[PDB]
């Protein structure tokens, strides 16, 4: 059953619970500051987000 | 003083119920590795204890060359 | 108005409120050579052996001395006393006497006015620190 199985012994370290918000991919995730992008998509969109390379 | 004694060497220990007295020295390493019960319980951690392997499991090939040599 | 820069060095600071008052001989409020770390305790005894007892009867320097680090907190007391004498003499009589005691103190040692600019530098790529690199295999 759905309610007899869900959240029984908790997924307190779920790794398949997150994905890139742009490409639905699970590796290279950047969860810092709530970005939730993979590192490649973040490098693609960093200038638009507001991160810039000063040093 | 009825203090629960965490100051001693071996509480809960096998081969003497209370903190009693036993004779002859030169055996402290043996007293920290009780050879009878581990051998009789047929344990693989028993082979760790007895063969000289790592009952906790330090890594041995180059590092961890002190501990079984 | 109020001109007050007190003494500071590296990290530590001896806030030196200069005004008229008792002005007894005290470092951290404590006696002449009595500081607990016991390492650099002579640095203040030197000048007061030249002028006399009358000269420090009206110079209250109330110091808030905060900061960990010997080379910081020490070597800041010398800066603080140099500035105290400088300001006192400049404001009261003339800058010629300030010229003279500042001359002896500063030409005596350069390192009051100058601090060490050296500071920990940034860590870089592919290495345990700033300059070291990770071992390269072949």
């Amino acid at each position: 059953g759905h309610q007899q199985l869900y959240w029984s012994h908790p997924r307190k370290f779920g790794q398949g619970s997150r994905s890139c918000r742009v490409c639905s991919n699970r590796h290279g995730l950047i969860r810092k500051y709530g970005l939730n992008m993979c590192r490649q998509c973040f490098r693609q969109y960093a200038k638009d987000i507001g991160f810039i390379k000063l040093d | 003083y009825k203090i629960p004694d965490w100051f001693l060497n071996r509480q809960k220990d096998v081969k003497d119920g209370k903190y009693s007295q036993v004779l002859a020295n030169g055996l402290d390493n043996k007293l920290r590795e009780d050879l009878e019960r581990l051998k009789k319980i047929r344990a693989h951690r028993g082979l760790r204890h007895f063969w000289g392997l790592r009952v906790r499991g330090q890594h041995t090939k180059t590092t961890g060359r002190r501990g079984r040599t | 108005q109020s001109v007050q820069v007190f003494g500071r060095k590296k990290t530590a600071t001896a806030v030196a409120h200069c005004k008229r008052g008792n002005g007894l001989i005290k470092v951290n409020g404590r006696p002449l050579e009595m500081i607990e770390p016991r390492t650099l305790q002579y640095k203040l005894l030197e000048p007061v052996l030249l002028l006399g007892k009358e000269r420090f009867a009206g110079v209250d320097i109330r110091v808030r001395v905060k900061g960990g680090g010997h080379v910081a907190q020490i070597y800041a007391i010398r800066q603080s006393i140099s500035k105290a004498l400088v300001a006192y003499y400049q404001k009261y009589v003339d800058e010629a006497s300030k010229k003279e005691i500042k001359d002896i103190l500063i030409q005596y040692d350069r390192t009051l006015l100058v601090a060490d600019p050296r500071r920990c530098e940034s860590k870089k790529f592919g290495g345990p620190g700033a300059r070291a690199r990770y071992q390269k295999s072949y």
Partner: protein, 120 residues
């Protein structure tokens, strides 16, 4: 909803990037150039700078209506709290987005690549 300043700024940047990408692939055929967002008390405007605005607004402002509806329904804006406009860019020849799109549509539309690129 209370959120930290770092997270708020990062989420604002994420919203700008997602909106830019969405309407880029939506109306790049209409000479899309850029988007700007102005957040002011009760007024959150989205300005779409594009070379041609005839199809960006469409007829009777149909396309602008659909864009506002989809943006509001996706990003959770309050109903009627976001109004997105569309204004022309004075100098189309100094935007690499517009000119790269123009070169793409000259290449797709049929032209020698050297001729299209030299015209651009």
């Amino acid at each position: 909803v209370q959120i930290s300043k770092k997270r708020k700024f990062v989420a604002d940047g994420i919203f700008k990037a997602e909106l830019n990408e969405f309407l880029t692939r939506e109306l790049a055929e209409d000479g899309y150039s850029g988007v700007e967002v102005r957040v002011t008390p009760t007024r959150t405007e989205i300005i779409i700078l594009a070379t041609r605005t005839q199809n960006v607004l469409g007829e009777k402002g149909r396309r602008i209506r659909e864009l506002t509806a989809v943006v509001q329904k996706r990003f959770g804006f309050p109903e009627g709290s976001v109004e997105l406009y569309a204004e022309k860019v004075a100098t189309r020849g100094l935007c690499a987005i517009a000119q790269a799109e123009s070169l793409r549509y000259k290449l797709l539309g049929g032209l020698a690549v050297r001729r299209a690129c030299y015209g651009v």
